[PDB]
Amino acid sequence: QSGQLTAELKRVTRLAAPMATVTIAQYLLPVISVMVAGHNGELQLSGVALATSFTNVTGFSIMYGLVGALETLCGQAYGAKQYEKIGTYTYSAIASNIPICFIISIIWFYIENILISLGQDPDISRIAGSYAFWLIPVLFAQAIVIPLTRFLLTQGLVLPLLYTAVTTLLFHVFVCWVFVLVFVLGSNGPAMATSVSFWFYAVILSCYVRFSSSCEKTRGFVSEDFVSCVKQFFQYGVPSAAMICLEWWLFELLILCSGLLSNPKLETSVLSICLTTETLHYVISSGVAAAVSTRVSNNLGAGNPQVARVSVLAGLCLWLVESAFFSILLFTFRNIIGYAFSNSKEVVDYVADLSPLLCLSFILDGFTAVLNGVARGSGWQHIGAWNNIFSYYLVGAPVGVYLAFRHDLNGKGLWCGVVIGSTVQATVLAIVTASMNWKEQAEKARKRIV
Ligand SMILES: CCCCCCCC/C=C/CCCCCCCC(=O)OC[C@H](O)CO
Ligand SMILES: CCCCCCCC/C=C\CCCCCCCC(=O)OC[C@H](O)CO
Ligand SMILES: CCCCCCCC/C=C\CCCCCCCC(=O)OC[C@H](O)CO
Ligand SMILES: [Rb+]
Ligand SMILES: [Rb+]
């Protein structure tokens, strides 16, 4: 019980701290692209931003979201010591990612035409389509990279994941410098640089997995298990992708809706601050979520339902410390933190007025991240996808648009809808996790990976 929790707290933390740093590096890479570019003109900035929003919505959200299937399959397979199937699951995921990358590439070919038909400036549209075209190799590199990241994570190999992720980040800073400053490749420079970095990420990961002693038992695949693994990859990858797509889409929709409020420059700038602050906090809870998913899937696959419950409890301990830390820290500098993003007194005062709501977002996002990690580790990501629709699009979006436009709350009203949607999401997640039959979920894990 108490020693149960202490041992599981140790293992959850041993995975959460490196994975939190991994997520930091993940989200720092696009920020480095924007910073090294340091774009001078509105035409370039808008076109690149449109390419980023389009490629994230239609492509990158799916690529990252699909490997939640590997969090279920490879995690439970590692728990049952079904080590050969881990590599079969991983390589079935890579092979399945190839046609999806082709579909997304075809869509990205039409980004200029689609944006023009959507009433956007033709120069902006061409710049966006060109940037996205040079982001296409990132898709095929991620077809290897992302499944390999779960290949290492599900086995508890978070240190090589952290090493290669940070090494890729520093490599990306270098190639951004050479492409933007030395080669002077222009607006497409960072996009081309990203394609190089992720392919570099692809080779070092593939090199480690191929040659390390840690991956000797789990590397390789079984031919007669390929088709079945592909089936399961889609079975749990389709909802896992939907969960991420609905989270990223809502982010984009928030910014889009802020452009329709009065004084849209003020409301969009301030909403950009709330979003940046939200993701800045979410990298930590993402590391906790990855640790909870790994330990939940491992213990379920190992036939230990009780320690799986304890894994959720240990992750909730990390959530309470982490969320209380960032909430109180933000509330302390609520009247000051705005000056870290803008020199306008109006923007800083606005962010100061929203900071309590952002603190509530910290608590909820950390809680829902942990419980969504339980979903990915157990196998009911479909509940999480339908919960994302119900919480944010059926409840959060109508209430937020209402308060923003009706009660003249503007961006505060939009974030009020975010807070309410996150509240009902946490409530559903808490009810489904408290009513879970852990012995059956372990039995379902044993059958899922045989
Ligand atoms: C006022 C309205 C309140 C309700 C509104 C919620 C709408 C969104 C919730 C969807 C989750 C549906 C809950 C289904 C619970 C089934 C439990 C279950 O399936 O556990 C098996 C495990 O997932 C192995 O498959
Ligand atoms: C087999 C599965 C293959 C998957 C292949 C991709 C699937 C997702 C693509 C589109 C749906 C996304 C929702 C609609 C996206 C609309 C485009 C958009 O977001 O445009 C933004 C721009 O800012 C406007 O001005
Ligand atoms: C099984 C789950 C099925 C899920 C079914 C749910 C349907 C989602 C509905 C709308 C999302 C729209 C997504 C597209 C949002 C893109 C908007 C955008 O790109 O905004 C411009 C950007 O902010 C630059 O200004
Ligand atoms: Rb979210
Ligand atoms: Rb959000």
Experiment used for this model = X-ray
Q: How far is the CA of 42 from the centre of ligand 3 (A)?
A: 24
Residue nearest to atom 23 of ligand 2 (CA): 50
Total structural domains within the chain:
1
Which pair of structure tokens corresponds to residue 341? 């993003």
Angle between helix 136-154 and helix 2-37 axes, rounded to 10 deg: 160
Residue nearest to atom 11 of ligand 2 (CA): 58
Q: How far is the CA of 424 from the centre of ligand 1 (A)?
A: 13
Measured in angstroms, the resolution is 2.3
Segments forming the whole domain that contains residue 371: 1-450
For CA atoms 148, 150, 152, 158, the dihedral sign is positive
**Per-residue DSSP letter, 39:** -
Q: Collapsing DSSP states into helix, strand and coil, what is residue 145? A: helix
Residue nearest to atom 5 of ligand 2 (CA): 104
Q: Give the residue carrying structure tokens 């020199």.
A: 343
Ligand whose nearest atom lies closest to the CA of 372: 4
Q: Give the residue carrying structure tokens 């939190």.
A: 20
Rounded Cα distance between 377 and 41, Å, is: 45
Distance of CA 379 to the CA centre of its chain: 18
Residue 404's contacts (CB-CB under 8 Å, 6 or more residues apart) are 257, 261, 410, 411, 412, 413, 414, 416, 417
Taking CB atoms within 8 Å and a gap of at least 24, the contacts of 160-163 are 160/208, 160/212, 160/214, 161/18, 161/19, 161/22, 162/18, 162/19, 162/21, 162/22, 162/25
Ligand whose nearest atom lies closest to the CA of 417: 5
Residue 289's contacts (CB-CB under 8 Å, 6 or more residues apart) are 315, 369, 370, 372, 373
Measured from the CB, is residue 45 less than 6 Å from ligand 3?
no
Positions of chain breaks in the chain, given as the residue before each break (C to N > 2.5 Å) = none
Question: At residue 24, what is the residue type?
Answer: I
Q: How far is the CA of 250 from the centre of ligand 3 (A)?
A: 6
Q: Collapsing DSSP states into helix, strand and coil, what is residue 26? A: helix
Residue nearest to atom 12 of ligand 2 (CA): 58
Concatenated DSSP letters of 343-367: S-HHHHHHHHHHHHHHHHHHHHHHH
Closest CA to 278 of 247, 303, 309: 247
The best mutation among 46, 48, 54 to test binding of ligand 2, ranked by most ligand atoms within 8 Å of the C-beta, falls on 54
Angle between helix 381-388 and helix 226-258 axes, rounded to 10 deg: 20
Concatenated DSSP letters of 161-209: HHHHHHHHHHHHHHHHHIIIIIS--GGGHHHHHHHHHHHHHHHHHHHHH
Beta carbons of 180 and 36 less than 8 angstroms apart: yes
Rounded Cα distance between 215 and 207, Å, is: 11
Residue nearest to atom 8 of ligand 3 (CA): 246
Concatenated DSSP letters of 287-342: HHHHHHHHHHHHHHHTT-HHHHHHHHHHHHHHHHHHHHHHHHHHHHTTTTGGGGT-
Residue nearest to atom 20 of ligand 2 (CA): 54
For CA atoms 262, 263, 264, 270, the dihedral sign is negative
Dihedral of CA atoms 271, 275, 276, 280 in degrees, nearest 10, equals: 150
Q: For the chain, how far is it from start to end, CA to CA, in angstroms?
A: 29
Largest CA distance in the chain: 65
Concatenated DSSP letters of 399-423: HHHHHHHTSS-THHHHHHHHHHHHH
Residue nearest to atom 19 of ligand 2 (CA): 54
- Using alpha carbons, list the distances in angstroms from residue 265 to 37, 129, 395, 409: 23, 25, 27, 15
Instruction: Spell 254-287 as b/e; 16+ CB within 10 A means b.
Output: bbebbeebeeeebbbbbbbbbbebbeebbbbbbb
Give one word for 303, left, alpha or beta, with left for phi > 0 and alpha for psi -120 to 50: left
Concatenated DSSP letters of 41-82: SHHHHHHHHHHHHHHIIIIIHHHHHHTHHHHHHHHHHHHTT-
Measured from the CB, is residue 390 less than 6 Å from ligand 1?
yes
Residue 344's contacts (CB-CB under 8 Å, 6 or more residues apart) are none
Closest CA to 138 of 61, 54, 196, 68: 196
- Using alpha carbons, list the distances in angstroms from residue 445 to 31, 43, 48, 76, 418: 39, 52, 44, 6, 34
Which pair of structure tokens corresponds to residue 64? 């990252």
Rounded Cα distance between 276 and 283, Å, is: 11
Measured from the CB, is residue 106 less than 6 Å from ligand 2?
no
Rounded Cα distance between 295 and 302, Å, is: 10
Rounded Cα distance between 39 and 45, Å, is: 6
What number of other Cβ atoms are within 10 A of residue 440's Cβ?
10
For CA atoms 236, 370, 300, 67, the dihedral sign is positive
383 CA: nearest ligand 1 atom: 11
78, burial (CB in 10 Å: exposed 0-12, middle 13-18, buried 19+): buried
Residue nearest to atom 3 of ligand 1 (CA): 428
Q: How far is the CA of 392 from the centre of ligand 4 (A)?
A: 8
13, burial (CB in 10 Å: exposed 0-12, middle 13-18, buried 19+): middle
Q: How far is the CA of 56 from the centre of ligand 2 (A)?
A: 9
Residue nearest to atom 8 of ligand 1 (CA): 387
Taking CB atoms within 8 Å and a gap of at least 24, the contacts of 193-196 are 193/33, 193/36, 194/29, 194/30, 194/33, 194/135, 194/138, 195/134, 195/135, 195/136, 195/137, 195/138, 195/141
Which pair of structure tokens corresponds to residue 234? 């889609």
The best mutation among 57, 63, 112 to test binding of ligand 2, ranked by most ligand atoms within 8 Å of the C-beta, falls on 57
Rounded Cα distance between 122 and 120, Å, is: 6
What number of other Cβ atoms are within 10 A of residue 188's Cβ?
19
Which pair of structure tokens corresponds to residue 382? 């479909």
Rounded Cα distance between 72 and 238, Å, is: 13
Dihedral of CA atoms 120, 121, 122, 125 in degrees, nearest 10, equals: -60
Rounded Cα distance between 150 and 142, Å, is: 12
Measured from the CB, is residue 254 less than 6 Å from ligand 3?
no
Which pair of structure tokens corresponds to residue 2? 């108490």
Rounded Cα distance between 411 and 403, Å, is: 9
Measured from the CB, is residue 371 less than 6 Å from ligand 2?
no
Beta carbons of 136 and 108 less than 8 angstroms apart: yes
Measured from the CB, is residue 115 less than 6 Å from ligand 2?
yes
